[PDB]
């Protein structure tokens, strides 16, 4: 399974670059379009903790270093891409915890919502719930990819 993971190692970094750039896009549309003082910090815990920005930077960095360490096979890119994947797995686990916490906060908010279009806060909470759900899916992909990169570059060193 060493070659069976090395053949898809570059894709397994490209998915981190993709998840990071979608994290940047979601963070910049939440930062620009939303007036975040009109909504609760429990509902916007994804943006209040800043996870799209510091998760986007770390996912793009670790995926880019994974792409470069596949494409160059340099002994300095490896152990730099491995450390980038350690901190990307830490960022993805913290993001998974933050997104589950924000899902719980959004469920507690939408308990007090008769419909998705009850007011502006219910709709923005449901939109954030949808965006938390498809950042939880992408963070699960990025976490599984980063853990697989960790397994490959640790079993390589065994």
């Amino acid at each position: 399974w060493q070659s069976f993971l090395k053949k898809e190692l570059e894709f397994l970094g490209v998915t981190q670059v993709l998840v990071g750039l979608i994290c940047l896009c979601f963070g910049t549309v939440v930062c620009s379009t939303l007036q975040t003082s009109d909504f609760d910090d429990e509902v916007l815990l994804l943006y209040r903790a800043g996870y799209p920005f510091w998760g986007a930077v770390l996912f793009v960095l670790s995926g880019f270093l994974s792409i470069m360490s596949e494409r160059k096979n340099t002994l300095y890119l490896v152990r730099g891409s491995l450390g980038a994947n350690i901190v990307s797995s830490i960022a993805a686990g913290l993001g998974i915890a933050i997104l589950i916490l924000n899902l719980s906060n959004n469920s507690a908010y939408m308990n007090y919502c008769k419909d998705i279009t009850e007011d502006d806060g219910c709709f923005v909470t449901s939109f954030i719930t949808e965006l938390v759900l498809m950042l939880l899916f992408l963070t699960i992909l990025a976490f599984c990819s980063a853990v697989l990169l960790i397994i490959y570059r640790i079993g390589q060193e065994f």
Binding site: I22, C25, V29, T33, L34, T117, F123, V124, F127, E130
Partner: protein
């Protein structure tokens, strides 16, 4: 409400990625055009 366009964020981010895919089609077709021309 005046926040409906946030749910226009999702398909627009789709029509970016699908657009990326047709680039990722063409850039995969031409490098598969240049790999069957050599045989």
């Amino acid at each position: 409400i005046e926040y409906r366009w946030l749910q226009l964020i999702f398909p627009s981010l789709a029509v970016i990625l699908f657009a990326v895919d047709t680039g990722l089609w063409f850039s995969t077709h031409k490098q598969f055009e240049s790999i069957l021309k050599i045989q």
